[PDB]
């Protein structure tokens, strides 16, 4: 149970805060688990998703597909992964968005900031 | 002691046929001039305690058993000793899987089921 008067348990407030979140806040909201191998290598359970990360879809009709993230659609909380598309009637392909929590990061797009972020969260690189 | 019914027709509310806004559920006429309230000639009947049925056969189905609403198998086992007195009636919101478990267990206990064939076939 929550014991802090600074956090609200109200459903109305929590749903307003979730769907009213700015992009900097949705960046945290769109987090994915690190794979077992990455977890034992970096000592980090989960990370925010970033473009060009290598992920595997874990849930849904696309369970098992893998690919890089071609776009994080923060305004809809969606990940557009390459080759995970849908064929429209006319023959064009509409990419299918996957929630960040339904994928798992198999390889990270490491930068100086990501390494700094990793060691910041009690991690090792 | 056969099941005897003092009446089979329901008691429809006065003028409920003429008007759709007037439901068929019985309502006591309060008008001090209501001819049916005064029980005039040819008027429809009104519910009376004399219409009540024999206490021995009251609440009993034509087969002679009383209906007992059952939601899961546990309620079925509750009717182990009253299978000659009570018939299991499976609830409408009980899913198909639990119905087959209820019906099969009722068959073992020798308990009649009023709607055994529903959502089970």
């Amino acid at each position: 149970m929550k014991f802090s008067r600074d956090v609200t348990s109200s459903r109305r407030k929590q749903r307003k805060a979730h769907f009213g979140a700015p992009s900097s806040v949705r960046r945290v909201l769109m987090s994915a688990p690190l794979s077992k191998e990455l977890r034992e290598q970096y000592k980090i359970r989960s990370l925010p998703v970033r473009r060009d990360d290598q992920i595997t879809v874990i849930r849904g009709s696309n369970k098992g597909r893998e690919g890089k993230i071609t776009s994080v659609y923060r305004k809809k909380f969606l990940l557009l992964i390459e080759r995970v598309t849908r064929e429209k009637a006319n023959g064009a392909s509409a990419p299918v968005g996957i929630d960040a929590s339904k994928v798992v990061i198999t390889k990270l797009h490491l930068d100086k900031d990501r390494k700094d972020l990793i060691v910041r969260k009690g991690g090792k690189v | 002691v056969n099941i005897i019914k003092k009446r089979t027709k329901p008691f429809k509310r006065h003028q409920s046929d003429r008007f759709k806004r007037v439901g068929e559920s019985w309502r006591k006429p309060r008008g001090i001039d209501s001819c049916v309230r005064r029980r005039f000639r040819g008027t429809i009947s009104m519910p009376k305690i004399g219409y009540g049925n024999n206490k021995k056969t009251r609440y009993c189905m034509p087969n002679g058993l009383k209906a007992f609403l059952v939601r899961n198998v546990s309620d079925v086992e509750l009717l182990l000793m009253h299978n000659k007195t009570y018939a299991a009636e499976i609830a409408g919101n009980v899913s198909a899987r639990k119905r087959v478990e209820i019906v099969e267990k009722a068959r073992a206990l020798g308990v009649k089921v009023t709607n055994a064939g529903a959502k089970v076939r």
């Binding site: 802090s4 008067r5 600074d6 700015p22 | -």
Partner: protein
Amino acid sequence: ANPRQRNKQRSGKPRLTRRNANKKAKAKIYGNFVIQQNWDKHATLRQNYARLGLLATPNYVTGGVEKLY
């Protein structure tokens, strides 16, 4: 519901949210260092004064006092 509250409901500028309210949090001791080192933040000031050997008030208490034992 006010015009001034409807003004920022439909606005894009975020509310000036401050997080300061945590009840049951008693004021921490500044002032005396010896009292601060021996003050347990959970207890009440009457419990703390009595444990330390001090009188919270030199006058009668206006109510029943706790009897734990």
